[PDB]
Design an enzyme around this catalytic site. Structure first.
Site, short mmCIF file in Angstrom:
data_model
loop_
_atom_site.label_atom_id
_atom_site.label_comp_id
_atom_site.label_asym_id
_atom_site.label_seq_id
_atom_site.Cartn_x
_atom_site.Cartn_y
_atom_site.Cartn_z
N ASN B 101 0.84 -1.17 0.00
CA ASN B 101 0.00 0.00 0.00
C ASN B 101 0.88 1.22 0.00
OD1 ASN B 101 0.66 0.70 2.91
ND2 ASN B 101 -0.82 -0.82 3.52
N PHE B 112 2.70 -8.65 -1.40
CA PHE B 112 4.07 -9.11 -1.24
C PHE B 112 4.01 -10.43 -0.51
CE2 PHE B 112 4.90 -7.92 3.32
CZ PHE B 112 3.95 -6.94 3.59
N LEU B 121 5.63 -4.93 10.26
CA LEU B 121 4.65 -4.55 9.25
C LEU B 121 3.26 -4.66 9.79
CD1 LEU B 121 6.34 -6.07 6.12
CD2 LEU B 121 6.20 -3.77 6.82
N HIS B 125 -0.18 -3.35 7.10
CA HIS B 125 -0.46 -3.94 5.78
C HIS B 125 -1.42 -5.05 6.08
CE1 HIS B 125 2.57 -1.92 3.55
NE2 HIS B 125 3.25 -1.94 4.67
#
Lengths: 220, 164, 220, 220, 220
Positions: B101, B112, B121, B125
């Site tokens: 994003n 990914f 992360l 995400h």
């Protein structure tokens, strides 16, 4: 709407144009009568929420009534979310989708999700719930469209008992109340508001007389 | 119940192997439907013939830019971008499939595949799937990438679709 | 339009004359009102681009609206061609060449090619894309037909509240500027333009008042 | 704004109330004049975008000018986005992401992200870029607030040369043009618009006479 | 207000008098205007709830606005208590209990408890929550102190376009009904209420016209 397809496997069949034309015609010709509710419930048997949204969008005119219908659908969805929140519990071995107030109203639920919720075992009654909501809204609308109150129904001096009882029962069916209230009203209000000439006739028959006896009494 | 999609990977046209993914549609349904539908190509556009434009050994392989082919594009089946559905699932290890994003509520089609645990992360995400079959094909892909992401050979999604 | 068979596969089917007749009749009788887009989307479910070009060319009269729709379709096709350039050279045997904007429109392609695109593996939804474009064009057309603006609404001293809210929500559905702007408008402009007596009857209920009580206040 | 803190580690120091009061006073008395751009650049040295937003929000009145400034900031952001594309993807743990076109204007960028972009090595000049944008906007506004054009500046019959040259140079500084054009504009307009007696007095000195000689010519 | 030290930790600090003096002066001198909220947010950065209650109680005059702010804070505190219910059972050893809706305001808690809440691990931002509540109250206050509505704006035959757009954007920033509705208003109501000559000069540029050309058209 989905339909039982040979053999035993329900598949999605889009709403037929003839059904939409029949609905548009009945809303054009009959406006908002008490009988439309049954015609609507019979024209949309087992319909996905998308089909009911289509049938409510295809209406022409009466935008105020459609707005009340949409607002009551929102209220029912709000109450439904309030009555059906996710309370913490052990997770079920088997997972089935779940319909939100907005997932039931067909606003943010894709057609595939609704087909899933309907054809899955056990089925989720999203269609019947949305139909109950729309039927409540239509009851509100038809009780609003009543021109005069049931208390104001009075017979003319020479108005025959036929048209009088017809109009009285029509307004009573359009009116909203419990069944016992109607049972009391048909015994307290019907005979009183009649024309005195036939009011004496109905009084001579008796208080607990049925409709057919009075009707054949004042007949002619 | 949860869909499974595959990717037949290619390195400059030589076939390399098949990676298949379980999409967690029971927790991230709108995110999982967008990757499923872009893999089948049923809405007219998708992943088939797009490449992994950024592969960082020991972190992740990123791909999915089918409009601009370099991380500046891609689009979803709901329009060009949509909300972060939720953050129930976390980046727990290799094989987790997560959405790329450009900050919050900017999901499109880039995704990914993690090749390591990337807890930093989390919360940023949406995770919506994991490798089912093919993780050594994802691992072998790392060799064609670099510290900054630039890949040395073209790595393509030769074919993709739904299995179950 | 394509239709599924008993075993699940689908093949082209000739367009029914009843569909064309109903579409032309509803266009003639109901002109260009908000309730033509749902009926258009219901009539041509799964229709090929040739069928949509038929349903558009068959509309006699209102040629300005059809020209607006053609211009909108042209702009959408140009943007689609700009965002998705087509590749050159030999095409793979198991894949059919991807359509361009002018071919997504169905202007320069045969019906068999549309059927091959729609029944390919994976299927390519050219019909749905062109239907979305036509729906956007029809939205612009119904925006153009809007008789009055939303701000000019003011209830007359004798015009009943029912007719006022009917006209208001009609032109509001014909406006379609946005959803949250519509929500703000139905809160402010609806109560801002009432007749003084019923105006203060509505202000007696405060801003928390809903539409149902808003109407039954001025009712009777 | 961030400031070098002992020793050698920049830490965030919030904007002081006295600076904001000085800014409000200079935008209360000086209002919009050529001197405001230099004062603004000195009051906001090394300011985070949040500080510049705070200094632009505190201005009371002149809402049209603030709207022009906001729109020009948006235009510069769009141009920066069109010139500096930002690639999507996971960020590196050591370095920060490239700021988008709206991350500069402090709209969607948290204070921590800006502090990172400024203190990182190499630093991202977000503050200077936003200052350049605000300075372009302020130049637009001060060139708009000019009451008359530079071509309309003319000396009165008995108006001394002092007031004439002062007003002329003030309007010329407020005006917007390249310095190369101004070099011809002065030598073409200063002597011509003067009083006839002082006109001949300056023409007696020569065309390329400096400002001080031209002044001391008609002194008194 | 808390302040960071050389080692990095923060501790309570007595409120500075020339902050209270500046706040009282700006409140009285500027009364209530949209540019009092940025000044308030800048003056009391990191202030404890006691400091905010000080800055509010210190405002002499305009007691109706302060009572509105107190009522808004009151309702906001009740909502916070309703949204989150304290958990039961044993508490973790590394964690201790939270404040209530009324204690967020600091009405029934000492300063040491506020400091412990603000410098806890993890820190609890009671000051920021109460500042958000006060900012909402001040927004409602500046809404009430608006001298007209957005629709009543009509430029006079002699009132310049600059003053018209200034008044428009002033009462628009004082409206704060929404942000996208503001974007629609600045397109429609701005162009709909111009003086006929300059009105058609603006219509000469079409709806694509921006504000700069919009004003330089009517300029001169």
């Amino acid at each position: 709407p989905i339909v039982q397809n040979i053999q035993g496997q329900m598949v999605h069949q889009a709403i037929s144009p003839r059904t939409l034309n029949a609905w548009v015609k009945v809303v054009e010709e009959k406006a908002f009568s008490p009988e439309v509710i049954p015609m609507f419930s019979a024209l949309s048997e087992g319909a996905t929420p998308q089909d009911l949204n289509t049938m409510l969008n295809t209406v022409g005119g009466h935008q105020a009534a459609m707005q009340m219908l949409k607002e009551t659908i929102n209220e029912e969805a709000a109450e439904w979310d309030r009555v059906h929140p996710v309370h913490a519990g052990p997770i079920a071995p088997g997972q089935m989708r779940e319909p939100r107030g907005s997932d039931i109203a067909g606003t943010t639920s894709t057609l595939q999700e609704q087909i899933g919720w309907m054809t899955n075992n056990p089925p989720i009654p999203v269609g019947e719930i949305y139909k109950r909501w729309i039927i409540l809204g239509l009851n509100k609308i038809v009780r609003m469209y009543s021109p005069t109150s049931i208390l104001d129904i009075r017979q003319g001096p020479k108005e025959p008992f036929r048209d009088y009882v017809d109009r009285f029962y029509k307004t009573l069916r359009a009116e909203q109340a419990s069944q016992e209230v109607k049972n009391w009203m048909t015994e307290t209000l019907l005979v009183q508001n009649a024309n005195p000439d036939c009011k004496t006739i109905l009084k001579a028959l008796g208080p607990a007389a049925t409709l057919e006896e009075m009707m054949t009494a004042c007949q002619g | 119940v949860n869909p499974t999609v595959f990717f037949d990977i290619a390195v400059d046209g030589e076939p390399l192997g098949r990676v298949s993914f379980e999409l967690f549609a029971d927790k991230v349904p709108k995110t999982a439907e967008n990757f499923r539908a872009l893999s089948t190509g049923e809405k007219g556009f998708g992943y088939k013939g797009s490449c992994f434009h950024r592969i960082i050994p020991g972190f992740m392989c990123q791909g999915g830019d089918f409009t601009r082919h370099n991380g500046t594009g891609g689009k979803s089946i709901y329009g060009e971008k949509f909300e972060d559905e939720n953050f129930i699932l976390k980046h727990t290890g290799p094989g987790i499939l997560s959405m790329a994003n450009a900050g919050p509520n900017t999901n499109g089609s880039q995704f990914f595949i993690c090749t390591a645990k990337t807890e930093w992360l989390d919360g940023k995400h949406v995770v919506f799937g994991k490798v089912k079959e093919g993780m050594n094909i994802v691992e072998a892909m790392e060799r064609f990438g670099s510290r900054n992401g630039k890949t040395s050979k073209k790595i393509t999604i030769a074919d993709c679709g739904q299995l179950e």
